[PDB]
Amino acid sequence: LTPAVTTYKLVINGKTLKGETTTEAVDAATAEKVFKQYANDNGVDGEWTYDDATKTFTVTEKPE
């Protein structure tokens, strides 16, 4: 693994906010964790994953 400190980006697409924020992480997991805490606080998390369509992360409200 590569224990490097990198910065990543996150976009939210809910019925609350439709903007973007960013965070710092070590690996994929770290990023996911900080972003989740934030998204929880906000009140979103239906489709909560990663985006490979402009190196971003995404929390959309499209549940099944």
Side-chain angles (χ1 to χ4, degrees):
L1 186 63
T2 300
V5 181
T6 301
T7 299
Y8 207 70
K9 305 187 71 181
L10 163 69
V11 184
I12 303 204
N13 307 303
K15 298 295 183 179
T16 54
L17 180 66
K18 291 195 179 65
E20 70 102 296
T21 315
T22 61
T23 197
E24 66 76 23
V26 174
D27 61 359
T30 301
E32 184 183 290
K33 184 62 176 297
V34 184
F35 275 152
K36 281 206 297 287
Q37 181 62 286
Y38 176 97
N40 181 61
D41 177 66
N42 177 187
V44 295
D45 52 1
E47 175 296 280
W48 209 169
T49 323
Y50 151 70
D51 159 286
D52 52 71
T54 302
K55 187 185 296 182
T56 305
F57 214 68
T58 327
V59 53
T60 300
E61 300 304 292
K62 187 191 66 58
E64 287 59 59

Coordinates of all heavy atoms in Angstrom, one line a residue:
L1 N 0.9 -1.2 0.0 CA 0.0 0.0 0.0 C 0.9 1.2 0.0 O 2.1 1.2 0.3 CB -0.9 0.0 1.3 CG -2.0 1.1 1.3 CD1 -3.0 1.0 0.1 CD2 -2.8 1.1 2.6
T2 N 0.3 2.4 -0.3 CA 1.1 3.7 -0.3 C 0.5 4.6 0.7 O -0.6 5.2 0.5 CB 1.0 4.3 -1.7 OG1 1.5 3.3 -2.6 CG2 1.9 5.5 -1.9
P3 N 1.1 4.7 1.9 CA 0.6 5.6 3.0 C 1.0 7.0 2.7 O 1.8 7.6 3.4 CB 1.3 5.0 4.2 CG 2.7 4.6 3.7 CD 2.4 4.0 2.3
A4 N 0.4 7.6 1.7 CA 0.6 9.0 1.2 C -0.6 9.8 1.6 O -1.7 9.3 1.7 CB 0.8 9.0 -0.3
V5 N -0.3 11.1 1.8 CA -1.4 12.0 2.2 C -1.8 12.8 0.9 O -1.0 13.5 0.4 CB -0.9 13.0 3.3 CG1 -2.0 14.0 3.8 CG2 -0.4 12.2 4.6
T6 N -2.9 12.5 0.5 CA -3.5 13.1 -0.8 C -4.8 13.8 -0.5 O -5.4 13.5 0.6 CB -3.6 12.0 -1.8 OG1 -2.3 11.4 -1.9 CG2 -4.0 12.5 -3.2
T7 N -5.3 14.6 -1.4 CA -6.6 15.3 -1.2 C -7.5 14.8 -2.3 O -7.1 14.5 -3.4 CB -6.4 16.8 -1.4 OG1 -5.4 17.1 -0.4 CG2 -7.6 17.6 -1.0
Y8 N -8.8 14.6 -1.9 CA -9.8 14.1 -2.8 C -11.0 15.1 -2.8 O -11.1 15.9 -1.9 CB -10.2 12.7 -2.4 CG -10.7 11.9 -3.6 CD1 -9.8 11.5 -4.6 CD2 -12.0 11.6 -3.7 CE1 -10.2 10.8 -5.7 CE2 -12.5 10.9 -4.8 CZ -11.6 10.5 -5.8 OH -12.0 9.8 -6.9
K9 N -11.9 14.9 -3.7 CA -13.1 15.7 -3.8 C -14.4 14.9 -3.7 O -14.5 13.8 -4.1 CB -13.1 16.5 -5.1 CG -11.8 17.3 -5.2 CD -11.8 18.3 -6.4 CE -12.8 19.5 -6.2 NZ -12.8 20.3 -7.4
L10 N -15.4 15.6 -3.2 CA -16.8 15.0 -3.0 C -17.9 15.9 -3.5 O -17.9 17.1 -3.3 CB -17.0 14.7 -1.5 CG -18.5 14.4 -1.2 CD1 -19.0 13.1 -1.8 CD2 -18.7 14.4 0.4
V11 N -18.9 15.4 -4.2 CA -20.1 16.2 -4.7 C -21.3 15.5 -4.0 O -21.3 14.3 -3.8 CB -20.2 16.1 -6.2 CG1 -21.4 17.0 -6.7 CG2 -18.9 16.5 -6.8
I12 N -22.3 16.3 -3.7 CA -23.5 15.8 -3.1 C -24.7 16.1 -4.1 O -24.7 17.2 -4.7 CB -23.7 16.5 -1.8 CG1 -22.5 16.2 -0.9 CG2 -25.1 16.0 -1.1 CD1 -22.7 16.3 0.6
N13 N -25.5 15.2 -4.3 CA -26.7 15.3 -5.2 C -28.0 14.8 -4.5 O -28.5 13.8 -4.8 CB -26.4 14.5 -6.5 CG -25.1 14.9 -7.1 OD1 -24.8 16.0 -7.4 ND2 -24.2 13.9 -7.2
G14 N -28.4 15.6 -3.5 CA -29.6 15.2 -2.7 C -30.7 16.3 -2.8 O -30.6 17.2 -3.7
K15 N -31.6 16.2 -1.9 CA -32.8 17.2 -2.0 C -32.6 18.2 -0.8 O -33.5 18.7 -0.2 CB -34.1 16.4 -1.8 CG -34.3 15.5 -3.0 CD -34.5 16.2 -4.4 CE -34.8 15.2 -5.5 NZ -35.0 16.0 -6.8
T16 N -31.3 18.4 -0.5 CA -30.8 19.3 0.6 C -29.8 20.2 0.0 O -29.9 21.4 0.0 CB -30.2 18.4 1.7 OG1 -29.2 17.6 1.2 CG2 -31.3 17.4 2.3
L17 N -28.7 19.6 -0.5 CA -27.6 20.3 -1.2 C -27.2 19.7 -2.5 O -27.2 18.5 -2.6 CB -26.4 20.4 -0.1 CG -25.2 21.1 -0.7 CD1 -25.5 22.6 -0.9 CD2 -24.0 20.9 0.4
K18 N -26.7 20.5 -3.4 CA -26.3 20.1 -4.7 C -25.0 20.9 -5.0 O -24.9 21.6 -6.0 CB -27.3 20.4 -5.8 CG -28.6 19.5 -5.6 CD -29.4 19.5 -6.9 CE -30.6 18.6 -6.7 NZ -31.5 19.1 -5.7
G19 N -24.0 20.7 -4.1 CA -22.7 21.4 -4.2 C -21.6 20.4 -4.0 O -21.8 19.2 -3.9
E20 N -20.4 20.9 -3.9 CA -19.2 20.0 -3.6 C -18.4 20.5 -2.5 O -18.4 21.7 -2.1 CB -18.4 20.0 -5.0 CG -17.6 21.3 -5.3 CD -16.1 21.3 -4.9 OE1 -15.8 21.1 -3.7 OE2 -15.3 21.4 -5.8
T21 N -17.7 19.6 -1.9 CA -16.8 19.8 -0.7 C -15.6 18.9 -1.0 O -15.6 18.2 -2.0 CB -17.5 19.4 0.6 OG1 -18.8 19.9 0.6 CG2 -16.9 20.1 1.8
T22 N -14.6 19.0 -0.2 CA -13.4 18.2 -0.4 C -12.8 17.7 1.0 O -13.2 18.2 2.0 CB -12.3 19.0 -1.1 OG1 -12.0 20.1 -0.3 CG2 -12.8 19.7 -2.4
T23 N -11.9 16.8 1.0 CA -11.3 16.3 2.2 C -9.9 15.7 1.9 O -9.5 15.6 0.8 CB -12.2 15.2 2.9 OG1 -11.7 15.1 4.2 CG2 -11.9 13.7 2.3
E24 N -9.2 15.4 3.0 CA -7.8 14.8 2.9 C -8.0 13.4 3.3 O -8.8 13.0 4.2 CB -6.9 15.6 3.8 CG -7.2 15.5 5.3 CD -6.7 14.1 5.9 OE1 -5.8 13.5 5.3 OE2 -7.3 13.8 6.9
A25 N -7.1 12.5 2.7 CA -7.1 11.1 3.1 C -5.8 10.4 2.9 O -4.9 11.0 2.4 CB -8.2 10.4 2.2
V26 N -5.7 9.2 3.4 CA -4.4 8.4 3.3 C -4.7 7.5 2.1 O -4.0 7.5 1.1 CB -4.3 7.6 4.6 CG1 -3.0 6.6 4.5 CG2 -4.0 8.6 5.8
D27 N -5.7 6.7 2.3 CA -6.2 5.7 1.2 C -7.7 5.9 1.0 O -8.4 6.6 1.7 CB -5.8 4.3 1.6 CG -6.5 3.8 3.0 OD1 -7.2 4.6 3.5 OD2 -6.2 2.7 3.3
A28 N -8.2 5.1 0.0 CA -9.6 5.1 -0.3 C -10.5 5.1 0.9 O -11.4 6.0 1.1 CB -9.9 3.9 -1.2
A29 N -10.2 4.2 1.8 CA -11.0 4.1 3.1 C -11.1 5.4 3.9 O -12.1 5.9 4.2 CB -10.4 3.0 3.9
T30 N -9.9 5.9 4.2 CA -9.9 7.2 5.0 C -10.8 8.2 4.4 O -11.6 8.8 5.1 CB -8.4 7.8 5.0 OG1 -7.7 6.7 5.6 CG2 -8.3 8.9 5.9
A31 N -10.6 8.4 3.1 CA -11.5 9.4 2.4 C -13.0 9.1 2.6 O -13.7 10.0 3.1 CB -11.3 9.3 0.8
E32 N -13.3 7.9 2.3 CA -14.7 7.5 2.5 C -15.2 7.8 3.9 O -16.2 8.4 4.1 CB -14.8 5.9 2.3 CG -16.3 5.5 2.4 CD -16.4 4.0 2.2 OE1 -16.2 3.6 1.1 OE2 -16.7 3.3 3.2
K33 N -14.4 7.4 4.9 CA -14.8 7.7 6.3 C -15.0 9.2 6.7 O -16.1 9.5 7.2 CB -13.6 7.2 7.2 CG -13.9 7.3 8.8 CD -15.2 6.5 9.1 CE -15.4 6.6 10.7 NZ -14.3 6.0 11.4
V34 N -14.1 10.1 6.3 CA -14.4 11.5 6.6 C -15.6 12.0 5.9 O -16.5 12.6 6.4 CB -13.1 12.4 6.2 CG1 -13.3 13.8 6.6 CG2 -11.9 11.8 6.9
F35 N -15.6 11.7 4.6 CA -16.8 12.1 3.8 C -18.1 11.6 4.4 O -19.0 12.3 4.5 CB -16.5 11.6 2.3 CG -15.6 12.5 1.5 CD1 -14.9 12.0 0.4 CD2 -15.6 13.9 1.6 CE1 -14.1 12.8 -0.4 CE2 -14.8 14.7 0.8 CZ -14.1 14.2 -0.2
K36 N -18.1 10.3 4.8 CA -19.3 9.8 5.4 C -19.7 10.6 6.6 O -20.8 11.1 6.7 CB -19.1 8.3 5.9 CG -19.2 7.3 4.7 CD -19.7 5.9 5.3 CE -18.7 5.3 6.3 NZ -17.5 4.8 5.5
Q37 N -18.8 10.8 7.6 CA -19.1 11.6 8.8 C -19.9 12.9 8.3 O -20.9 13.2 8.8 CB -17.8 12.0 9.5 CG -18.1 12.8 10.8 CD -18.9 12.0 11.8 OE1 -20.1 11.9 11.6 NE2 -18.3 11.5 12.9
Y38 N -19.2 13.6 7.4 CA -19.8 14.9 6.9 C -21.2 14.6 6.3 O -22.2 15.3 6.7 CB -18.8 15.4 5.8 CG -19.3 16.7 5.1 CD1 -18.9 17.9 5.5 CD2 -20.2 16.6 4.0 CE1 -19.3 19.1 4.8 CE2 -20.7 17.7 3.4 CZ -20.2 19.0 3.8 OH -20.6 20.1 3.1
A39 N -21.3 13.7 5.4 CA -22.7 13.4 4.8 C -23.7 13.1 5.8 O -24.9 13.4 5.7 CB -22.5 12.2 3.8
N40 N -23.3 12.3 6.8 CA -24.3 12.0 7.9 C -24.7 13.3 8.6 O -25.9 13.5 8.6 CB -23.5 11.1 8.9 CG -24.5 10.6 10.1 OD1 -25.5 10.0 9.8 ND2 -24.2 11.0 11.3
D41 N -23.8 14.0 9.0 CA -24.1 15.4 9.7 C -25.1 16.1 8.9 O -26.2 16.5 9.4 CB -22.8 16.2 9.7 CG -23.0 17.6 10.3 OD1 -23.4 17.6 11.5 OD2 -22.9 18.5 9.6
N42 N -24.8 16.2 7.6 CA -25.7 16.9 6.6 C -27.1 16.3 6.7 O -28.1 17.0 6.9 CB -25.1 16.8 5.2 CG -25.9 17.4 4.1 OD1 -25.6 17.2 2.9 ND2 -27.0 18.1 4.3
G43 N -27.2 15.0 6.4 CA -28.5 14.3 6.4 C -28.7 13.6 5.1 O -29.8 13.5 4.7
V44 N -27.6 13.1 4.5 CA -27.7 12.5 3.1 C -26.9 11.1 3.2 O -26.1 11.0 4.1 CB -27.2 13.4 2.0 CG1 -28.0 14.7 1.9 CG2 -25.7 13.8 2.4
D45 N -27.2 10.2 2.3 CA -26.6 8.9 2.1 C -27.6 7.8 1.6 O -28.1 7.0 2.3 CB -26.0 8.4 3.5 CG -27.1 8.4 4.7 OD1 -28.2 8.8 4.5 OD2 -26.6 8.0 5.8
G46 N -27.8 7.8 0.3 CA -28.7 6.9 -0.4 C -27.8 6.0 -1.3 O -27.8 4.8 -1.2
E47 N -27.0 6.7 -2.1 CA -26.1 6.1 -3.1 C -24.8 6.8 -2.6 O -24.6 7.9 -3.0 CB -26.5 6.5 -4.5 CG -25.5 6.0 -5.6 CD -24.1 6.7 -5.4 OE1 -24.0 7.9 -5.9 OE2 -23.2 6.1 -4.9
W48 N -24.0 6.2 -1.8 CA -22.8 6.8 -1.2 C -21.5 6.1 -1.6 O -21.1 5.1 -1.0 CB -23.0 6.8 0.3 CG -22.3 7.9 1.1 CD1 -22.7 8.1 2.3 CD2 -21.4 8.9 0.7 NE1 -21.9 9.1 2.7 CE2 -21.1 9.6 1.8 CE3 -20.8 9.1 -0.5 CZ2 -20.2 10.7 1.7 CZ3 -19.9 10.2 -0.6 CH2 -19.6 10.9 0.5
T49 N -20.9 6.5 -2.7 CA -19.7 5.9 -3.2 C -18.6 6.9 -3.8 O -18.5 8.0 -3.4 CB -20.0 4.8 -4.2 OG1 -21.2 4.2 -3.7 CG2 -19.0 3.6 -4.0
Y50 N -17.9 6.3 -4.7 CA -16.8 7.0 -5.5 C -17.2 7.3 -6.9 O -18.1 6.7 -7.5 CB -15.6 6.0 -5.3 CG -14.6 6.0 -6.5 CD1 -13.8 7.0 -6.8 CD2 -14.6 4.9 -7.3 CE1 -12.9 6.9 -7.8 CE2 -13.7 4.8 -8.4 CZ -12.9 5.8 -8.6 OH -11.9 5.7 -9.7
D51 N -16.5 8.2 -7.5 CA -16.7 8.7 -8.9 C -15.4 8.7 -9.6 O -14.4 9.2 -9.2 CB -17.3 10.1 -8.8 CG -17.1 10.9 -10.1 OD1 -16.0 11.3 -10.4 OD2 -18.1 11.1 -10.8
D52 N -15.4 8.0 -10.8 CA -14.2 7.9 -11.7 C -14.5 8.7 -12.9 O -13.9 8.5 -14.0 CB -14.1 6.4 -12.0 CG -15.4 5.8 -12.5 OD1 -15.7 6.1 -13.6 OD2 -16.0 5.0 -11.8
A53 N -15.4 9.7 -12.7 CA -15.8 10.6 -13.8 C -15.4 12.1 -13.4 O -16.3 12.9 -13.3 CB -17.3 10.4 -14.1
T54 N -14.1 12.2 -13.2 CA -13.4 13.5 -12.7 C -12.8 13.4 -11.3 O -12.9 14.3 -10.5 CB -14.4 14.7 -12.8 OG1 -14.8 14.8 -14.2 CG2 -13.6 16.1 -12.7
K55 N -12.2 12.2 -11.0 CA -11.6 11.9 -9.7 C -12.3 12.6 -8.5 O -11.8 13.4 -7.7 CB -10.1 12.3 -9.8 CG -9.3 11.9 -8.6 CD -7.8 12.5 -8.7 CE -7.1 11.9 -9.9 NZ -5.7 12.5 -10.0
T56 N -13.5 12.2 -8.3 CA -14.4 12.7 -7.2 C -15.1 11.6 -6.5 O -14.9 10.4 -6.8 CB -15.5 13.6 -8.0 OG1 -14.7 14.6 -8.7 CG2 -16.2 14.6 -7.0
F57 N -15.8 11.9 -5.5 CA -16.6 11.0 -4.6 C -18.0 11.4 -4.7 O -18.2 12.6 -5.0 CB -16.0 11.1 -3.2 CG -16.0 9.7 -2.5 CD1 -15.1 8.7 -2.9 CD2 -16.8 9.4 -1.4 CE1 -15.1 7.5 -2.3 CE2 -16.7 8.2 -0.8 CZ -15.9 7.2 -1.2
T58 N -19.0 10.6 -4.5 CA -20.4 11.1 -4.6 C -21.4 10.5 -3.6 O -21.4 9.3 -3.4 CB -21.0 10.8 -5.9 OG1 -20.0 10.9 -6.9 CG2 -22.0 12.0 -6.3
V59 N -22.3 11.3 -3.2 CA -23.4 10.9 -2.3 C -24.6 11.5 -3.0 O -25.0 12.7 -2.9 CB -23.1 11.5 -1.0 CG1 -22.8 13.0 -1.0 CG2 -24.1 11.2 0.1
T60 N -25.3 10.6 -3.6 CA -26.6 10.9 -4.3 C -27.7 10.2 -3.5 O -27.4 9.4 -2.6 CB -26.5 10.3 -5.7 OG1 -25.4 10.9 -6.3 CG2 -27.7 10.6 -6.6
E61 N -28.9 10.6 -3.7 CA -30.1 10.1 -3.0 C -31.0 9.2 -3.9 O -32.1 9.5 -4.2 CB -30.9 11.2 -2.3 CG -30.0 12.1 -1.4 CD -29.3 11.1 -0.3 OE1 -30.1 10.7 0.5 OE2 -28.1 11.0 -0.4
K62 N -30.3 8.1 -4.3 CA -31.0 7.2 -5.3 C -30.9 5.8 -4.6 O -30.0 5.0 -4.9 CB -30.2 7.2 -6.6 CG -30.9 6.3 -7.7 CD -30.0 6.1 -8.9 CE -28.8 5.3 -8.6 NZ -29.2 3.9 -8.0
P63 N -31.8 5.5 -3.7 CA -31.8 4.2 -2.9 C -32.6 3.2 -3.7 O -33.4 3.5 -4.6 CB -32.4 4.6 -1.6 CG -33.5 5.6 -2.0 CD -32.8 6.4 -3.2
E64 N -32.5 1.9 -3.4 CA -33.2 0.8 -4.1 C -34.1 0.1 -3.0 O -33.8 -1.1 -2.8 CB -32.2 -0.2 -4.8 CG -31.5 0.5 -6.0 CD -30.7 1.8 -5.7 OE1 -29.9 1.7 -4.9 OE2 -31.1 2.8 -6.3

